[PDB]
Amino acid sequence: KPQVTILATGGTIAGSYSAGAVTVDKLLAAVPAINDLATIKGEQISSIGSQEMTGKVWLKLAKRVNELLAQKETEAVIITHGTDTMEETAFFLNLTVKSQKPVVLVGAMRSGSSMSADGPMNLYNAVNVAINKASTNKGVVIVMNDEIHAAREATKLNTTAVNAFASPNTGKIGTVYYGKVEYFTQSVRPHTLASEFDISKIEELPRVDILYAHPDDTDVLVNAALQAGAKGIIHAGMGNGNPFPLTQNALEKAAKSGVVVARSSRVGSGSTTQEAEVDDKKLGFVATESLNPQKARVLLMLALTKTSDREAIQKIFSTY
Amino acid sequence: KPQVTILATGGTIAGSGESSVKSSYSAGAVTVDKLLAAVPAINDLATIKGEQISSIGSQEMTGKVWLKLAKRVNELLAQKETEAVIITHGTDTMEETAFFLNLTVKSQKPVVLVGAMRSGSSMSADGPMNLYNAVNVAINKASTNKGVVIVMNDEIHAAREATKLNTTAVNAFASPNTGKIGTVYYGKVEYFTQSVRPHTLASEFDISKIEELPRVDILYAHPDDTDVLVNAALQAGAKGIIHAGMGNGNPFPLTQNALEKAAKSGVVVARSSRVGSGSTTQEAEVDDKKLGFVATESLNPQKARVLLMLALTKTSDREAIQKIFSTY
Amino acid sequence: KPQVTILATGGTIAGSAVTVDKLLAAVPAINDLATIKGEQISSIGSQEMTGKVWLKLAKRVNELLAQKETEAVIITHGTDTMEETAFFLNLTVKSQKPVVLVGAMRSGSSMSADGPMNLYNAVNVAINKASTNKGVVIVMNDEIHAAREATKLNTTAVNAFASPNTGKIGTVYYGKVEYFTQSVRPHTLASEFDISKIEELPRVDILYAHPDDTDVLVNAALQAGAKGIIHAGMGNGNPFPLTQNALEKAAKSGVVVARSSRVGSGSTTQEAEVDDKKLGFVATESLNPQKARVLLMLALTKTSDREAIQKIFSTY
Amino acid sequence: KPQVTILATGGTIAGSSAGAVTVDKLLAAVPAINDLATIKGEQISSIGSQEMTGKVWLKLAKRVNELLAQKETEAVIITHGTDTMEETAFFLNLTVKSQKPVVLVGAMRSGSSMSADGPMNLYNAVNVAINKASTNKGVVIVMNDEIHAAREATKLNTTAVNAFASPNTGKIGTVYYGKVEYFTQSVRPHTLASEFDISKIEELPRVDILYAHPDDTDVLVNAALQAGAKGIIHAGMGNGNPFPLTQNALEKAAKSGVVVARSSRVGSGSTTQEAEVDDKKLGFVATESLNPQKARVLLMLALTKTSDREAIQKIFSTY
Ligand SMILES: N[C@@H](CCC(=O)O)C(=O)O
Ligand SMILES: N[C@@H](CCC(=O)O)C(=O)O
Ligand SMILES: N[C@@H](CCC(=O)O)C(=O)O
Ligand SMILES: N[C@@H](CCC(=O)O)C(=O)O
């Protein structure tokens, strides 16, 4: 049997021999068929809802994943996670885990005690994906609702639906249906081993704020973010990354002062492009291209561990 | 043939390199004359008058322009000879304008917003067809009492439901919680559904005597979030805050504490979501009655901001504002 | 509390009339919402459905909703052809009272079975005051879909149901029901169809278009006594030439040929590439082949006139 | 600048010597193309895509193979009607023996229409064809600023300019005013990796498609058998399920040596093995994550090599 570690970041996503953590033992009690597929070890990394996630928990999680996958006996890692910010954690890991071994994030849109709880099947499927030979070198994945999503592309796109996860710019890379795993595509953007980021010696991540653009917008939130020590700002702009004039002036000021301003969009999908209506080279801004504000924040945070140069950060957004 | 006024809020959404000026007819505004020159088939469908209400990209829109636009639409539709109004508009904030109008226009006559995702000078510009289709929708008898609509990419979207969901695509407009209410294909209009949420004549909002709208900020939630943007919004005089929360409208704890403070101080805090679709629900993880918050339900942050702005012209009571979000 | 009848046909629905009693044992919270009566109308997978079962079901629903004590009907049904049954009922049930169809994409004995929640939500929709006069609805995966618009769009997903031309009309989330839109196409009471005295429905075949297509399937359908043919055409309802010739023959012989599309969404339009008036064809517009077949079947109970059938497709 | 051949299968997709009049009209309508590449043109057929036939597919595939064998040819672009572009693309994806780009492109709106999509689609298609990252992606469809893998692409709407989709996987890349970016690629074998070879083939095997529904029939199966069908795609209800009467007739067809492959009418997802239909007992193949029309193409090619159930199942589980 392959050996897999499940890292829990909160409560049980399913249900209502010790693997080595009470949450994971409850999961194995709820979904006993998992034991036929793999030898499961368990650890409790944090005990929070995903809306309480912090960079400190991310760094801890990434370092631990790296240390687990460096072990000869460990075939893969599964992380149970709240759905609200699973995309951010998955993306962070996708650029910080230095292995080709599978890393799978999984959660549940419905409570484990609910009628028609999604967790049991999601978890079962996640274990099957983790142990599948074809999952090697796919990068970090999210497995939800019979679907396998690349971490670069995945987002929570609905407040409540069991099918809330989507990859709006590319679609799912594969399927998993009652444990049967099939890949149809893979990301051609560099991840994991190919990533230039290394967080092994990092204790705190740089501060990056996100601003929400709208008509009759303001400068006061840019200024508050500067005042609070923001190293970067993601601007979730109107349409193709467009700011209101008053806000643009403030962002220009921010940029001149050494804070990295990266243009994303509030709309939900598509690329926030270079050489559209905003003169990024003149104003000192970066275009985040085909990401979303929350995932752009993650990438900018990592970029800021290496550099605050406009051109080098643009190149990072145009690569990853 | 019916008489329709096209209100332009910026440049031409169709054509390039046109003249306004032709011997047979003008409409009363250069932008609109250029539209007619670019799409001459429009003149067979309706008698077109034109006005220039503003001259901006939609990313520069302001409450002042919205008030001006709404009052003018109300005037135009009060005229016996005016069958409908079409507003040409930038795509970036067309959804906010449409939604504002949907709650402030006191008529059953059609109001149609239309734009173009591609420049009129571009290869394969979408504006000419979008505009032609918009005119056909504006004059169609079935468009009466549908509320304010957006017409883009052969589709008719209810203002309550519409959003720009993509940065660049000609098909960027969607109604993610309900779909389009109708279609328009080479001018052929069909409706399949209609909103059952009150709009236009049935709206309780009235902006005829309003000069400035209340200030409502929007915040973007994320892990390791902060209190400093709530505080800055309070300091700047925010009457309301839309919180674009994680998942089903969930805040980070530090931010929640600041929002609770904001609520206690009389600022209306309304929970929406960053995710893109679905309802930010009551009686989920956030105790809204205890904390003093409103749940915006099936809107999005930007449209929730509009509704809260209008609500704040009448009241800042939590229960009354919740009822407004649960009605409109 | 309101009285509701659940009709089982049934499919694989909740838990590991007896079927309805098992549902109530699996989802006991339903008993707090309504007084549930149960009947077994058929005992089949929905891939075995027939016009005889549809007629029986519709007559029974009409009888039940004519009763003063009956607030609504819920029909448990297999997912494969739920859309066809819902659409049929939408044009044949003569009442404003709610009719809700509900099923499950996963077996009731499966991990994470969808049936229990679907059923619970369906009862809540059936008894909601806003569900009156919405027409027949499908309730699946927290969503309320109008029968006219609904289709099964995926082979296996719990979210397989969609309304690709319009979206869902409402939501139901842990029993909380909200409507955001409603159909403006006539249904139920406003329908001109009446099946109370009908024992067999007219035969309507469906053909699948493709490059290098054939005439032999048109001919076989004619030979087998087809009163209508739905052609699931390429793109905007377009036939291969050999097939078109055969369909023209079929039309001249009195068989109604209606153009739909294989693509999955959008309207198969009039006045596109196919000269329908010349060739003798009807354009089905914004339906799909399977639902167009239902509507043509009903139309054929009243008429086989091209213009009248086009008017029916342009109305319903 | 790179040399690219545009093969036209019908009229102009844009506007109202490269070596073919259609292609010269395209260059007149979209002159910016000439800055990107040296364009040669050929007229392979002169038809709407609803009139496509295997004969035109064979001709097209052989010609593409010839053109890409030429050192001077960087890529091929094929202008095509939208209705059956997905079939032609899928066929070429399994028959073109090269890593050089092959790009299919069309227009949902007529070139003479207001807001015609052809000019931009064509411009974008040339940019994709000449991009270095398009090598070894397989055959692609370029429409509405999107790059779709041939295996996954389908026309999903009757009229919309955004009618093309990849419902099981999404687009593999984007092209926006000529700027090309790939985000994914297919991991299913295509082009050079395909086992199919049509260089000596003159006619493809006959494969019919049947549309399933309640109260279904056996007469269409029988007519297809009578007409010489080597295979039948059954577009089944839900997860590839037949009506009983029809299943009996398909079982008969299978026993008689006709390959029966189960797909679905629904639009997306896999028609799976080991669901409600006992394929091994009845003699059927499950087409998995394709659609009826593309399953037909793959079965047609499979039938040039074998009519064995197990070998055809393996083909559907591979490509
Ligand atoms: N807000 C919770 C919801 C539970 C879930 O859907 O995962 C979380 O993300 O932690
Ligand atoms: N972003 C500008 C450009 C035009 C458009 O995209 O509609 C605007 O919103 O006005
Ligand atoms: N194909 C079966 C699946 C089981 C179910 O849907 O209940 C049916 O349509 O009945
Ligand atoms: N049905 C025609 C029209 C052109 C088009 O839609 O691309 C074809 O496919 O050739």
Side-chain angles (χ1 to χ4, degrees), chain A, chain B, chain C residues 1-15 17-316, chain D:
Chain A
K1 276 190 327 191
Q3 183 165 300
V4 172
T5 298
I6 299 177
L7 307 183
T9 59
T12 56
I13 62 159
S16 54
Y17 180 68
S18 178
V22 171
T23 302
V24 178
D25 290 328
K26 291 193 224 199
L27 298 175
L28 298 170
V31 196
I34 286 163
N35 288 149
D36 301 322
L37 302 171
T39 298
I40 305 300
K41 302 282 152 93
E43 310 180 17
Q44 189 79 47
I45 295 292
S46 54
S47 294
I48 48 163
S50 81
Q51 69 269 56
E52 308 173 75
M53 276 279 168
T54 62
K56 167 169 156 163
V57 179
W58 293 353
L59 289 164
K60 185 182 179 195
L61 183 58
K63 288 168 186 170
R64 189 61 188 146
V65 170
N66 274 317
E67 90 183 30
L68 291 159
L69 298 175
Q71 304 170 347
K72 265 151 201 292
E73 60 265 20
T74 300
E75 275 261 310
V77 171
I78 297 162
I79 298 160
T80 64
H81 201 286
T83 58
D84 293 356
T85 69
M86 193 180 303
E87 74 203 74
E88 284 135 310
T89 299
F91 192 80
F92 184 82
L93 292 170
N94 205 41
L95 298 174
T96 57
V97 171
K98 302 307 183 151
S99 176
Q100 295 201 347
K101 298 183 185 175
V103 177
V104 180
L105 284 83
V106 62
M109 291 292 303
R110 291 172 180 165
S111 160
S113 58
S114 172
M115 292 177 282
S116 304
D118 53 324
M121 186 80 84
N122 285 344
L123 179 62
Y124 180 76
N125 285 337
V127 175
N128 283 282
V129 169
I131 71 178
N132 195 267
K133 304 223 194 207
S135 301
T136 290
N137 205 30
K138 292 291 187 292
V140 172
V141 295
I142 289 173
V143 171
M144 292 291 281
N145 190 47
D146 308 340
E147 296 168 12
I148 310 176
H149 293 273
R152 193 200 177 274
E153 306 303 333
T155 185
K156 186 172 173 169
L157 201 64
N158 187 263
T159 52
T160 55
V162 300
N163 55 299
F165 284 82
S167 291
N169 301 313
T170 64
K172 66 191 186 279
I173 63 168
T175 55
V176 54
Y177 183 62
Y178 285 85
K180 186 209 206 299
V181 176
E182 295 254 66
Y183 287 89
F184 293 96
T185 65
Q186 67 186 10
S187 178
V188 297
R189 311 286 283 203
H191 52 73
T192 57
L193 270 183
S195 175
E196 81 200 48
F197 304 103
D198 181 340
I199 50 66
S200 59
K201 325 286 204 261
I202 298 217
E203 175 269 325
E204 196 185 13
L205 291 156
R207 184 190 166 109
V208 175
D209 287 286
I210 305 174
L211 304 180
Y212 204 112
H214 58 79
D216 232 335
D217 214 337
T218 180
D219 50 356
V220 306
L221 308 176
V222 176
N223 296 339
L226 293 172
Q227 194 73 60
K231 300 314 190 203
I233 296 170
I234 303 307
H235 183 258
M238 295 170 269
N240 189 1
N242 296 313
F244 184 78
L246 180 55
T247 310
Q248 177 187 112
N249 293 343
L251 289 168
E252 187 179 10
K253 186 231 283 104
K256 264 156 164 162
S257 96
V259 177
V260 180
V261 175
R263 292 192 310 103
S264 188
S265 175
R266 73 187 193 166
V267 303
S269 71
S271 178
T272 302
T273 63
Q274 298 196 54
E275 307 194 329
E277 299 173 59
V278 183
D279 189 349
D280 291 314
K281 285 141 185 180
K282 174 153 68 201
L283 295 161
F285 303 161
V286 166
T288 61
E289 299 179 323
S290 190
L291 287 178
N292 67 10
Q294 51 270 34
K295 285 183 285 168
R297 165 167 177 276
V298 175
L299 184 53
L300 183 55
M301 281 169 70
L302 292 163
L304 287 167
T305 72
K306 284 192 67 154
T307 179
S308 62
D309 182 69
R310 206 209 47 86
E311 271 174 49
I313 291 177
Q314 183 64 75
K315 182 171 143 79
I316 283 162
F317 278 91
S318 297
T319 304
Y320 290 99
Chain B
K1 60 192 180 35
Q3 183 165 301
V4 172
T5 297
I6 299 178
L7 305 183
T9 60
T12 56
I13 61 159
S16 56
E18 300 299 343
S19 187
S20 32
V21 190
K22 274 158 314 242
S23 63
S24 294
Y25 186 71
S26 177
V30 173
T31 301
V32 179
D33 289 330
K34 289 193 223 199
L35 298 175
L36 298 170
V39 196
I42 286 163
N43 288 149
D44 302 322
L45 303 171
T47 299
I48 305 300
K49 302 282 151 92
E51 309 181 15
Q52 190 79 43
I53 294 292
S54 54
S55 294
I56 48 164
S58 81
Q59 68 269 56
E60 307 173 73
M61 274 280 168
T62 61
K64 167 168 157 163
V65 178
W66 292 355
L67 290 163
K68 184 183 180 195
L69 183 59
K71 288 167 186 172
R72 188 62 187 147
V73 171
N74 274 316
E75 288 171 29
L76 287 159
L77 299 175
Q79 303 171 347
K80 247 217 132 127
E81 61 265 20
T82 301
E83 250 79 279
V85 170
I86 297 161
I87 298 160
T88 65
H89 201 287
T91 58
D92 291 355
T93 68
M94 191 182 303
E95 75 203 75
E96 284 135 307
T97 301
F99 190 81
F100 184 82
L101 293 169
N102 203 44
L103 298 173
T104 57
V105 171
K106 302 307 182 150
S107 177
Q108 294 203 342
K109 298 183 184 175
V111 178
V112 178
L113 283 84
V114 61
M117 293 291 302
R118 290 171 181 169
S119 160
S121 59
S122 171
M123 291 177 285
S124 305
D126 55 324
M129 187 80 84
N130 285 345
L131 181 61
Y132 180 78
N133 285 338
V135 175
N136 280 281
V137 171
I139 71 178
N140 196 269
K141 302 228 193 207
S143 299
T144 288
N145 204 34
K146 292 292 187 292
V148 173
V149 295
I150 288 174
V151 174
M152 293 292 280
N153 192 44
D154 307 340
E155 296 169 4
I156 308 177
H157 294 272
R160 193 200 177 277
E161 305 302 335
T163 185
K164 188 172 174 168
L165 202 63
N166 188 266
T167 50
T168 55
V170 300
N171 54 301
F173 285 81
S175 291
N177 300 314
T178 63
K180 65 191 186 279
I181 64 168
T183 55
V184 55
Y185 183 61
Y186 285 86
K188 187 209 205 299
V189 178
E190 294 250 56
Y191 288 88
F192 294 98
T193 67
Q194 68 184 199
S195 178
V196 297
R197 311 287 283 206
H199 52 73
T200 58
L201 268 182
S203 175
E204 81 199 59
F205 304 103
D206 182 340
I207 51 65
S208 59
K209 337 233 214 165
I210 299 217
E211 298 296 326
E212 197 183 14
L213 291 156
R215 186 189 167 115
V216 175
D217 287 285
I218 306 174
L219 304 179
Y220 206 113
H222 57 80
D224 231 337
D225 214 339
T226 179
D227 51 356
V228 308
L229 307 176
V230 177
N231 295 338
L234 292 171
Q235 194 73 60
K239 300 315 191 203
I241 296 171
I242 303 307
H243 184 258
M246 297 170 269
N248 189 359
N250 297 311
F252 184 79
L254 178 55
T255 310
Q256 178 187 110
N257 294 340
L259 289 168
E260 187 179 11
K261 193 191 50 211
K264 264 155 164 162
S265 97
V267 175
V268 179
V269 176
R271 290 191 311 104
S272 186
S273 176
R274 73 189 191 164
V275 303
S277 71
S279 180
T280 300
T281 61
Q282 297 197 54
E283 308 195 333
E285 299 174 57
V286 183
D287 190 346
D288 290 316
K289 286 155 187 180
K290 174 143 284 198
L291 293 162
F293 302 162
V294 166
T296 62
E297 297 180 324
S298 190
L299 287 178
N300 66 14
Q302 51 268 39
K303 285 184 286 167
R305 165 168 177 276
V306 174
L307 184 54
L308 182 56
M309 282 168 70
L310 291 162
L312 286 167
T313 71
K314 283 192 67 154
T315 179
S316 62
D317 184 67
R318 206 210 85 267
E319 271 173 48
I321 291 177
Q322 184 65 73
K323 183 169 143 79
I324 282 163
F325 278 87
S326 298
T327 304
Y328 289 101
Chain C
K1 60 192 187 178
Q3 181 166 298
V4 172
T5 296
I6 299 177
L7 307 182
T9 63
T12 58
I13 128 147
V18 172
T19 302
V20 180
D21 291 325
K22 290 193 224 198
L23 298 175
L24 298 170
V27 196
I30 285 163
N31 289 319
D32 301 321
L33 302 171
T35 298
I36 305 300
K37 303 276 190 91
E39 310 180 15
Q40 190 77 49
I41 295 292
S42 54
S43 295
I44 48 163
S46 79
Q47 70 268 51
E48 308 174 75
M49 274 279 168
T50 61
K52 168 167 156 163
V53 178
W54 293 351
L55 290 163
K56 184 182 180 195
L57 182 59
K59 289 168 185 171
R60 189 62 189 148
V61 169
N62 274 317
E63 288 172 27
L64 290 159
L65 298 175
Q67 304 170 347
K68 281 192 191 293
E69 61 264 29
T70 300
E71 250 80 278
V73 170
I74 299 162
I75 297 160
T76 64
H77 202 284
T79 59
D80 291 356
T81 68
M82 194 181 303
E83 75 202 76
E84 282 137 305
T85 300
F87 192 80
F88 185 82
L89 291 170
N90 207 40
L91 298 173
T92 57
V93 172
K94 302 307 183 151
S95 176
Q96 294 200 349
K97 297 185 184 175
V99 178
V100 178
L101 284 83
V102 62
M105 292 292 302
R106 290 171 182 169
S107 160
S109 59
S110 173
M111 290 177 281
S112 303
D114 54 326
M117 186 79 84
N118 285 343
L119 179 61
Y120 181 76
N121 283 335
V123 175
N124 282 283
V125 170
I127 71 179
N128 197 266
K129 90 219 197 207
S131 298
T132 289
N133 205 30
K134 293 291 186 292
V136 174
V137 294
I138 288 174
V139 172
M140 292 292 280
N141 190 48
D142 307 341
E143 296 168 10
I144 311 174
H145 292 271
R148 193 199 177 273
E149 304 303 331
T151 186
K152 186 172 174 169
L153 202 63
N154 188 268
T155 52
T156 56
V158 299
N159 55 301
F161 284 81
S163 291
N165 301 311
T166 65
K168 65 192 186 279
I169 63 169
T171 56
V172 55
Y173 184 59
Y174 285 85
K176 187 209 206 299
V177 176
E178 296 253 67
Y179 289 89
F180 294 99
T181 66
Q182 68 185 10
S183 181
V184 297
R185 310 286 284 205
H187 52 74
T188 56
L189 269 183
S191 175
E192 81 198 60
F193 303 103
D194 180 343
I195 51 66
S196 59
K197 324 287 204 166
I198 298 217
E199 299 296 328
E200 197 183 14
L201 291 156
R203 185 189 166 110
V204 175
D205 286 287
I206 305 172
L207 305 180
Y208 205 113
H210 57 80
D212 234 332
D213 214 339
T214 180
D215 51 355
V216 305
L217 307 175
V218 176
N219 294 340
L222 293 171
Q223 195 72 61
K227 300 313 191 204
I229 297 170
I230 302 307
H231 184 259
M234 296 170 269
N236 188 359
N238 295 309
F240 186 77
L242 179 56
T243 311
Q244 177 184 288
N245 294 340
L247 289 168
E248 186 179 10
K249 187 231 283 104
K252 264 155 164 162
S253 96
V255 175
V256 181
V257 177
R259 293 192 309 103
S260 187
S261 175
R262 72 187 193 165
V263 305
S265 72
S267 178
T268 303
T269 62
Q270 299 194 241
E271 307 194 332
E273 298 174 59
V274 183
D275 189 347
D276 291 315
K277 286 155 188 180
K278 175 143 284 198
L279 294 162
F281 302 162
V282 166
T284 62
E285 298 178 326
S286 191
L287 286 179
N288 65 15
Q290 53 269 37
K291 285 183 286 168
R293 165 168 177 275
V294 178
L295 183 54
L296 182 54
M297 281 167 70
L298 292 163
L300 288 167
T301 71
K302 284 192 66 153
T303 179
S304 62
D305 183 68
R306 205 209 47 86
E307 272 173 49
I309 290 177
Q310 183 63 77
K311 181 171 143 79
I312 282 163
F313 278 91
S314 298
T315 303
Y316 289 99
Chain D
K1 60 193 187 178
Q3 182 165 302
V4 173
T5 296
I6 297 177
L7 307 183
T9 59
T12 58
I13 60 159
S16 298
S17 181
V21 172
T22 301
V23 178
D24 292 326
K25 292 192 224 199
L26 297 176
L27 299 170
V30 197
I33 288 163
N34 287 322
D35 301 321
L36 303 171
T38 299
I39 305 301
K40 302 282 152 93
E42 309 180 17
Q43 191 77 46
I44 293 293
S45 54
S46 294
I47 49 162
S49 82
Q50 70 269 52
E51 308 174 74
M52 275 280 167
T53 62
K55 166 168 156 163
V56 178
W57 294 357
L58 290 163
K59 183 182 178 195
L60 182 58
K62 287 168 185 171
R63 189 59 189 151
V64 171
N65 274 317
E66 289 173 28
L67 288 160
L68 299 175
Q70 302 172 346
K71 265 151 201 292
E72 62 264 29
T73 302
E74 250 79 278
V76 170
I77 296 162
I78 298 160
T79 63
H80 202 283
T82 58
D83 291 357
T84 67
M85 192 182 302
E86 74 202 73
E87 284 136 304
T88 299
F90 191 79
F91 184 81
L92 290 170
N93 204 45
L94 297 173
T95 57
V96 171
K97 300 307 183 151
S98 176
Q99 295 201 348
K100 298 185 184 174
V102 178
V103 179
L104 281 84
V105 62
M108 292 292 303
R109 291 171 182 169
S110 161
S112 60
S113 171
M114 291 175 283
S115 302
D117 54 326
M120 187 78 85
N121 285 347
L122 179 61
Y123 181 76
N124 284 334
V126 177
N127 282 285
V128 171
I130 73 178
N131 198 266
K132 305 225 194 208
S134 300
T135 290
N136 206 30
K137 291 292 186 291
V139 174
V140 295
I141 289 173
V142 174
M143 292 293 279
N144 191 49
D145 309 338
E146 296 168 7
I147 310 176
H148 292 271
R151 191 201 177 275
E152 305 302 335
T154 185
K155 185 172 175 170
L156 212 216
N157 187 270
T158 51
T159 56
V161 299
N162 52 299
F164 284 80
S166 291
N168 302 312
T169 64
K171 64 191 187 280
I172 62 170
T174 56
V175 54
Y176 185 60
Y177 285 88
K179 188 208 205 300
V180 176
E181 293 251 53
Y182 288 89
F183 295 99
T184 66
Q185 67 186 7
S186 180
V187 298
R188 311 286 283 205
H190 53 71
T191 57
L192 270 183
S194 173
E195 80 198 60
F196 304 104
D197 180 344
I198 50 66
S199 61
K200 323 288 204 168
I201 297 217
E202 178 283 326
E203 196 183 14
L204 291 156
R206 185 190 166 111
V207 175
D208 287 283
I209 305 174
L210 303 180
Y211 205 112
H213 56 81
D215 232 334
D216 213 338
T217 180
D218 50 357
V219 307
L220 307 175
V221 175
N222 295 337
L225 293 171
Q226 194 73 60
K230 301 313 191 204
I232 296 171
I233 302 307
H234 183 255
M237 296 171 268
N239 190 0
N241 298 310
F243 185 77
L245 179 55
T246 309
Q247 178 186 109
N248 293 343
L250 290 167
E251 187 179 353
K252 187 231 283 103
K255 264 156 163 162
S256 97
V258 176
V259 180
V260 175
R262 290 191 310 104
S263 186
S264 176
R265 72 188 192 166
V266 302
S268 72
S270 180
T271 301
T272 64
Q273 297 193 236
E274 307 195 332
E276 298 178 57
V277 183
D278 189 347
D279 292 314
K280 285 155 187 180
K281 173 143 285 199
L282 295 161
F284 303 163
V285 166
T287 61
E288 298 180 323
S289 191
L290 286 178
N291 66 12
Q293 50 270 35
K294 284 184 286 168
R296 165 168 177 276
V297 174
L298 183 52
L299 183 55
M300 281 168 69
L301 290 163
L303 287 167
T304 71
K305 283 192 67 153
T306 178
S307 60
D308 182 69
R309 206 210 86 268
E310 271 173 49
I312 291 177
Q313 184 64 74
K314 182 171 142 79
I315 283 163
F316 278 90
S317 298
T318 304
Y319 288 98

